[PDB]
Design a protein around this ligand. Structure first.
Ligand SMILES: C/C=C(\C)CC/C=C(\C)CCC=C(C)C
Lengths: 371, 986
């Protein structure tokens, strides 16, 4: 009841908004601890018919279930308790002072390699927990990802999640279009494909990699179905000048999640085993054959020499290179993107007609207007 | 047997007060002259200067067990009564001004700031001085309430009770009235321009709360002597204080007089974060080693101003920077804040700091200098190294205002007085958290047949007749009722003016002539406007109005909103309740709606758990009404009804409110709006609506784009003039006049609830808002502009509000970015700090020219980067391009200089044409696409601007983005003007 809601919490200010759900900050009176409450209008202002009123409850009743199946894990919010009324459904969870990753990705257009590594290190380690418990999300968008004051990822809105029965593969289309895996559309356009399994989350996570490190979705174009053929066919490019400055270890791991065929996809457990997420543990013996020692000393030299060489190569900003090609070189390109999102950062929102790629023009107008 | 040591040490304080303050009290009037040179008594200064006497009298009264220390306590107490009574006679001799100011909040009808200390007469005229100082009457009203609460009998007659009651209406509109303020100079420019200062708004809020249900006769008083204060105006002052702070006004980033609002004596700020943030802002920007500057660029007695000119020219403001006179008065406020807050450290750092600026005089008594001024020779040194040169004491010696709080602070810091004795009304607890209140709602049915529709949907309601003896009335009736509070025919006082009543007033239970009264909230009133005829808007207004209630209720009992369901709130069929209201009603039964706890019930159940205010002035026009109350095609008809002539408003008959009746039932918004224009139906809260937008550091422009016809609102305008300005700016078209004010409500609605949509717009241009809203509703459902013009009249208020939010929030339903640049440069939407970034660039240049209109670097010194006047100068240059889309091209072109300016060490040292950088960028955008395979067809020129239409549609970033070509052409122009350049820091 609503009395049970106000006997423990008091909502102070409005944090965010949604289609029918409102996120509101509250104070827990017994503990005086900051907590977020999401306030879903079940009746939805009267627009919801009794079916949607019932369906939203069943979706919400299910929604408590998954958030009740996963708990105590560092990188998904804890549904502290849930209150249901005839007209609302209150869900109290942790307070994330900073907003979604979309808002952050708007502030910093291109998210740096070190920062994304721990971001997704959590997300992949999030993905492992879901797959080990056999629960797929189907909704892994950055707006579904919440960040706290220490930048820690808090995956949010398992609203589209559903627990696969052991060895069962879904058919319903759930998810905003860009972040849908190729067989999501294929199952939508054919009945022979008997469904998709838990490998769906791998593609959605690999999409964040292209968005975070480049500021654009891997496949984006303004009409709806055209994006889909880029997805199922799987035509993606680490285009220039943007994607050449990043290290090569980035590219391969991006392709692994982005393979169109599900069985060859890079599952979460081995996903964390790719060279990017390797960590330097100080206490390792690391024994090596005499050839192995010789490489290390050679590689230690090869490294030092390399670092001097790479740096010597960086071209200081001069008048001419600005005139010929600003985007080509990193410091000016990241700047143009940065002041691109300060002027029109309000023009990026959730959906298809408001994605971040609308703020980037990487192709000639003629090729864009070819068809 | 002997006097206590407290009495002995008070004698030294008695000598200090007598030798410094009480020896100047006029024998006849009890007033205090400012100084020997300024032989007049200021209302604000006299009230402040009497605090030491009042504190001393309270300190002496603590031990009144002997004849002598009873008598000196009596002297100090009645000397305070003499001054406060003497100041009452000064204002009571200007009752004509008080009566006139209540209805027309003009400077020409304001109580005089200074009076004759010898005869309580006006020394100067209504125009020979800056007289409107709402923080001077409020400092009187606040302490009058406090001194009565402490036991001082100041008010002597019920006529003076009516006068003080009428003085409440005098200071009620402080949130919507511009005034010269605490420093009698208005804005920072000192040019006779009144502005909305937080000191006046804050002071009135505290005075209104201090006078709220206060018996002016003390304990031995009755309901006839009680001052009634409406929390609508009290919390409206809060909405302005929260928006203004930490700023003092739109022209002042900070004022040290805000110490008189955040801590003492106002305590007008309820958020402790705001108090600390504003106090620390004063710390960084104002305090030095000789006090605190009143406000940045003050120059009141700076040796760089001529003491003969009463006004300051615009260029003189930059001459006062960093050499402003410093007043130790504000350090007594910090001492007083520490005593109230309980920061012994604070009462120590500002006590030793003040003790080193106090100038010893007479027989060793400390004198508080009015200000410390920079010696004329040493002005250049403080220009370079701030707040280190030795200053000389100037101005008044002693500053009788500041001297009193110094003694008052000294009295309360050495245990001779407690914060509660100087603040008997407990204003010091304004910062303690207040829990949100449970809003009681009693849904009612206008007729029995509506009760069955609600019952069929499971809604427990009483009919309008079932509530009798409790009888419900429109919010207007309550406004008429208060027009009889403070009426005195002999004193020619007409009571409270007609002001719109919000929920905080209409959510109380009213006891008029022993009959309990509940008044319907105003947003459901349908006769005034058409915002109550959209049922989707009733929920939206109700949703915010409960949210306003729960967080801003400061009365005994719980608020009670009586919500009568009317036939208009039913469906078009007439047998079903509208879904939006239907959802709203069940929402309230479950106990939560709009962030507020709603305890739905019957009006009888809430009799004992509500604010039962007894309206004693009704106890033996509106009284006469209350005495009986206690006991072919429609579209064609307007063409008929407008070709009757200009609306004659008389009986040339052969009452459009009757014609307005059916259209409210059929809810055709295009027709109903036209009737509102031709009947001149006007909203009752546009003057708080404009003020709320104004108080958030915005300038409101209503009217179509051209400047002579588009009028800017920078100061809070009263209800009549603001509406007249809108009507005159309506250039005769009645449809725009309503849409202008209709959008104004929605702008204020979103401003109060979502302040983030206006962070990129510093000037709210309503007039083009209809235009920019027309284009998107023109491109959607593709049609002509005239059809869109007819279309714009046709949407529901909620749809109109949504579509405006569709405009402001940046959500999208020629080209994509052509529609995102015609919507970004037509609203003059600029990134956060862009006006603060032009200042940096102009210091590296000689100017910024747009279409051959220069914005020189002389502006950088003239106004500060954060000055909104500077924002106007950059803005004014940027509207020299008529076409909206090209303006945004100029806008991001300006920033590509900003980002290139940081990289470039050297300065261009000449003019830069922001327009041209787009043009070769258009030219250079041309060449690359030609080389890559663009046809002449796709690269088609914009007829007026000269930019390719594809360049308008091009994305901002990318290899081929608009700001890559403009980061490209912002270098060839620097080639010719700067032959040699050095770029560093990448
Ligand atoms: C490193 C910049 C290289 C080409 C661009 C040229 C820069 C400028 C021509 C002057 C514009 C702003 C100045 C603020 C001081």
């Amino acid at each position: 009841s609503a009395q049970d809601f106000y006997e423990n919490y008091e909502p102070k200010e409005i944090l965010g908004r949604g289609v029918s759900s409102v996120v509101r900050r509250c104070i827990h009176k017994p503990t005086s601890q900051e907590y977020a409450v999401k306030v879903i209008d079940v009746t939805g202002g009267g627009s919801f018919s009794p079916e949607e009123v019932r369906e939203l409850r069943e979706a919400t009743l299910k929604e408590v279930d998954i958030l009740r199946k996963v708990s105590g894990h560092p990188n998904i919010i804890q549904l502290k308790d849930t209150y249901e009324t005839n007209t609302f459904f209150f869900l109290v969870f942790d307070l994330m002072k900073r907003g979604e990753l979309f808002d952050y990705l708007t502030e910093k257009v291109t998210l740096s390699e070190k920062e994304t590594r721990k971001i997704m290190r959590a997300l992949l380690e999030v993905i492992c927990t879901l797959h080990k418990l056999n629960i797929v999300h189907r909704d892994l968008k950055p707006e579904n990802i919440l960040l706290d004051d220490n930048m820690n990822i808090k995956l949010t809105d398992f609203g589209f999640s559903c627990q696969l029965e052991p060895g069962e593969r879904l058919r319903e289309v759930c998810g905003t279009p860009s972040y849908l895996a190729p067989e999501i559309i294929e199952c939508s356009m054919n009945e022979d494909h008997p469904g998709y399994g838990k490998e769906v989350d791998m593609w959605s996570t690999g999409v964040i990699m292209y968005t975070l490190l480049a500021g654009s979705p891997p496949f984006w174009h303004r009409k709806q179905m055209l994006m889909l053929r880029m997805i199922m066919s799987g035509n993606y490019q680490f285009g220039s000048p943007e994607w050449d400055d990043y290290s090569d270890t980035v590219k391969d791991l991006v392709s692994r999640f982005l393979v169109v065929q599900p069985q060859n996809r890079y599952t979460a457990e081995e996903a964390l085993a790719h060279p990017f997420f390797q960590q330097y543990l100080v206490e390792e013996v690391r024994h090596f054959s005499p050839r192995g020692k010789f490489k290390v000393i050679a590689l230690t030299v090869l490294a030092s020499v390399r670092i001097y060489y790479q740096y010597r190569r960086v071209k200081p900003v001069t008048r001419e290179i600005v005139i010929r090609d600003p985007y080509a070189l990193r410091p000016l390109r990241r700047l143009i993107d940065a002041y691109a999102f300060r002027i029109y950062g309000h023009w990026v929102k959730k959906g298809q007609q408001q994605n971040r790629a609308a703020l980037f023009e990487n192709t000639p107008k003629a090729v864009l207007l070819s068809l | 047997r002997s006097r206590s040591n407290s009495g002995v040490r008070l004698d030294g304080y008695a000598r200090l007060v007598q030798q410094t303050i009480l020896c100047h009290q006029n024998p006849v009037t009890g007033l205090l002259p400012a100084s020997y040179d300024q032989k007049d008594a200021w209302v604000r200064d006299n009230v402040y200067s009497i605090l030491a006497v009042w504190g001393l009298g309270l300190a002496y009264r603590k031990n009144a067990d002997r004849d002598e220390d009873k008598a000196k306590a009596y002297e100090l107490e009645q000397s305070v009564v003499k001054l406060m009574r003497g100041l009452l006679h000064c204002m009571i001799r200007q009752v004509d001004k008080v009566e006139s100011f209540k209805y027309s909040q003009s400077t020409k009808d304001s109580l005089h700031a200074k009076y004759n200390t010898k005869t309580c007469a006006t020394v100067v005229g209504d125009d020979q001085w800056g007289h409107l100082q709402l923080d001077a009457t409020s400092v009187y009203l606040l302490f009058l309430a406090q001194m009565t609460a402490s036991g001082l009998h100041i008010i002597h007659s019920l006529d003076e009770v009516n006068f003080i009651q009428n003085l409440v209406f005098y200071i009620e509109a402080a949130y919507k009235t511009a005034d010269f303020g605490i420093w009698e100079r208005g804005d920072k420019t000192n040019q006779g321009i009144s502005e909305l200062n937080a000191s006046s708004v804050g002071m009135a809020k505290a005075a209104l709360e201090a006078l709220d249900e206060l018996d002016l006769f003390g304990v031995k008083g009755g309901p006839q002597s009680v001052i009634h204060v409406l929390a609508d105006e009290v919390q409206h002052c809060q909405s302005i204080l929260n928006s203004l702070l930490p700023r003092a006004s739109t022209s002042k980033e900070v004022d040290a007089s805000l110490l008189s609002v955040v801590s003492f004596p106002a305590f007008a700020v309820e958020d402790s974060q705001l108090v600390e943030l504003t106090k620390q802002e004063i710390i960084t920007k104002l305090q030095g080693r000789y006090g605190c500057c009143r406000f940045l660029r003050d120059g009141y007695k700076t040796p760089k101003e001529d003491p003969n000119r009463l006004y300051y020219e615009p260029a003189e403001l930059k001459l006062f920077e960093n050499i402003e006179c410093e007043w130790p008065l504000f350090w007594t406020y910090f001492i007083l804040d520490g005593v109230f807050s309980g920061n012994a450290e604070q009462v120590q750092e500002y006590k030793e700091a003040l003790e080193a600026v106090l100038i010893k005089g007479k027989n060793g008594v400390p004198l508080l200098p009015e200000l410390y001024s920079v010696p004329p020779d040493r002005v250049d040194e403080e220009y370079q190294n701030p707040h280190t040169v030795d200053r000389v004491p100037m101005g008044k010696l002693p500053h009788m205002w500041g001297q009193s709080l110094y003694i008052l602070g000294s009295l309360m810091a050495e245990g001779f007085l407690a914060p509660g004795e100087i603040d008997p009304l407990n204003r010091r607890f304004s910062t303690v958290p207040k829990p949100d209140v449970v809003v009681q709602v009693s849904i009612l049915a206008e007729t029995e047949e509506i009760k069955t529709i609600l019952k069929d949907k499971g809604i427990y309601v009483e009919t309008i007749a079932e509530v009798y003896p409790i009888r419900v009335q429109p919010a207007r009736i309550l406004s008429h009722i208060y027009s009889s509070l403070g009426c005195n025919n002999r004193m020619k006082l007409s009571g409270r003016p007609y002001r719109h009543m919000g929920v905080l007033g209409t959510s109380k239970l009213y006891d008029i002539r022993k009959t309990i009264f509940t008044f319907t909230p105003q947003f459901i009133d349908q006769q005034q406007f058409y915002l109550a005829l959209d049922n989707k808007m009733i929920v939206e207004m109700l949703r915010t109005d409960l949210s306003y209630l729960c967080s801003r209720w400061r009365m005994t009992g719980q608020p009670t909103i009586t919500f009568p369901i009317s036939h208009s709130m039913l469906d078009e069929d007439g047998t079903s309740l509208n879904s939006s209201i239907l959802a709203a009603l069940r929402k309230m039964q479950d106990g939560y709606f709009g962030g507020a706890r709603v305890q739905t019930g019957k009006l009888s159940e809430f009799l004992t758990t509500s604010c039962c205010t007894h309206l004693s002035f009704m106890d033996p026009e509106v009284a006469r009404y209350l005495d009986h109350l206690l006991a072919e095609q429609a579209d064609i008809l307007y063409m008929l009804y407008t070709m009757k002539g200009p609306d004659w408003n008389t009986e040339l008959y052969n009452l459009l409110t009757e014609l307005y009746g059916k259209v409210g039932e059929i809810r055709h918004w295009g027709l109903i709006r036209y009737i509102s224009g031709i009947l001149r139906k006007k909203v009752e809260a546009l003057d708080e609506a404009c003020t709320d937008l104004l108080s958030h550091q915005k300038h409101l422009t209503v009217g179509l784009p051209p400047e002579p016809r588009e009028k800017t609102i920078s100061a809070p305008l009263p209800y009549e003039a603001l509406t007249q300005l809108i009507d005159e700016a309506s250039e005769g078209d009645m449809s725009i006049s309503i849409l202008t004010q209709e959008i104004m409500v929605y702008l204020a609605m979103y401003m109060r609830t979502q302040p983030g949509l206006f962070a990129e717009m510093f000037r709210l241009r309503i007039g083009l808002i209809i235009q920019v809203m027309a284009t998107e509703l023109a491109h959607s459902l593709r049609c002509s502009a005239e059809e869109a013009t007819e279309g714009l009249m046709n949407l529901s208020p909620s749809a109109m509000k949504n579509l405006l939010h569709h405009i402001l929030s940046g959500k999208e339903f020629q080209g994509q970015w052509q529609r995102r640049r015609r919507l970004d440069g037509a609203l003059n939407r600029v990134p956060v700090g862009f006006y603060q970034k032009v200042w940096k660039v102009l210091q590296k240049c000689h100017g910024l020219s747009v279409e051959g209109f220069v914005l020189p670097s002389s502006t950088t010194r003239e106004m500060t980067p954060g000055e909104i006047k500077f924002s106007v100068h950059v803005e004014s240059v940027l509207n020299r391009v008529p076409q909206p889309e090209y303006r945004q091209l100029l806008v991001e072109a300006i920033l590509v200089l900003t980002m290139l300016a940081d990289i470039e060490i050297h300065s261009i040292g000449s003019i830069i044409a922001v327009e041209k950088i787009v043009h070769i960028a258009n030219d250079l955008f041309l060449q690359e696409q030609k080389t890559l395979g663009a046809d002449d067809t796709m690269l088609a020129k914009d007829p007026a601007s000269g930019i390719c239409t594809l360049l308008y549609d091009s994305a901002p970033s990318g290899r081929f983005g608009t700001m890559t070509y403009l980061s490209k052409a912002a270098a060839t122009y620097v080639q010719e003007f700067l032959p040699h350049s050095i770029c560093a820091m990448q």
